[PDB]
Assembly symmetry: C3
Homo-oligomer: 106 residues x 3
């Protein structure tokens, strides 16, 4: 299991969501963040820009799927399109039922 | 060391916090997020986000099952959307005020 | 690759941003969070555990930069009073820059 964290432009949320659900990736967590990349917030002094952070936990088999769909959906081709961080998840538990791992993600 | 990340119904934060603290787990970070799971935002094609709270608690390996059990007992209501919990590795914890590390930075 | 998460006092954001960028650490994500540590949101006695406003910094870097990031975070954010903050380091398997599809070292670099 992996966690996928993607920072994207806020207006791209809808397209990203649709692309993931259509590919059978259903379950994600969204929050509001500010940030900068290599260009230090310049569309020198350094600025933070509004972004959205998507968090998506899946089975290792699905990681490349999640990455492609976000990239396809979030790319405009201008600087500040986002960045994606894949990190390990040791264990997932659904709270309602107590199911673990594969059963908690499907 | 591990990070436990629990997404829960917002109203359940108080109970969750007291349960954790009374079990000796003391240090957590909370943020407002939106989300959906399997049922796509529906309690009732469409997919919607609902407001959830995300709890992050970094603890030692030996405390993980305690954190999980306490969050589950406090957070469950019995209905879809009760939450989900992810445990992930943490290499290093550092207390900024003293520069203390790891077990002494969590204790 | 490591993710550094630092929970700091909100008014320290600028000092941290300056210290880090000047050390060659350029790329960061900030969010608003609430928290308590060992002293349970406190500072007469007091009985409720309270959440206080904090900022979460997330900085992904190459392994060779972890020490610099911690040093600069400590120096910028410390005040000597409780609640100064906590830093968590955790592994990153893969980084992808969405504009180009560059990965890992390229996608963390300034190039
Ligand atoms: N190393 C990093 N660590 C944590 N967050 C980062 C990092 N790099 C970028 N971010 C976050 O991702 C957002 C998007 O970054 P961005 O797309 O600007 O990356 P970039 O490397 O500058 O690529 P580009 O050249 O296409 O702009 C940033 O505003 C910030 O939130
Ligand atoms: N795979 C996932 N990745 C990231 N976040 C998730 C995932 N699944 C759920 N979440 C987050 O946890 C929240 C609660 O999920 P929820 O409890 O509805 O999970 P579920 O698997 O659908 O279980 P249930 O059948 O009990 O609803 C979601 O709104 C979302 O924020
Ligand atoms: N074990 C933990 N897990 C998750 N978040 C934590 C933990 N400990 C602290 N935090 C977060 O970091 C913030 C600052 O912590 P704080 O500096 O008060 O740590 P401390 O251990 O109490 O050290 P000090 O004695 O200097 O106050 C908290 O408000 C909370 O957001
Ligand atoms: O965030 C943007 O839209 C442009 C600025 C940028 O790419 C950056 O700060 O890295
Ligand atoms: O989040 C809720 O309270 C109901 C919706 C749900 O369970 C889901 O989207 O998976
Ligand atoms: O967060 C603060 O500024 C003081 C309270 C504190 O240190 C804590 O809850 O651990
Ligand atoms: Mg950029
Ligand atoms: Mg659900
Ligand atoms: Mg404290």
């Amino acid at each position: 299991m992996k966690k996928i964290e993607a920072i994207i432009r806020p207006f791209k949320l809808d397209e990203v969501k649709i692309a993931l659900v259509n590919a059978g990736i259903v379950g994600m967590t969204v929050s509001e963040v500010r940030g900068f990349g290599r260009q230090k917030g310049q569309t020198y002094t350094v600025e933070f820009l509004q972004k959205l952070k998507l968090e998506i936990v899946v089975e290792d088999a699905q990681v490349d799927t999640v990455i492609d769909k976000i990239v396809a959906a979030a790319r405009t081709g201008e600087i500040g399109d986002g960045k994606i961080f894949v990190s390990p998840v040791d264990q997932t538990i659904r709270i309602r039922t107590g199911e673990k791992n594969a059963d908690a993600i499907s």
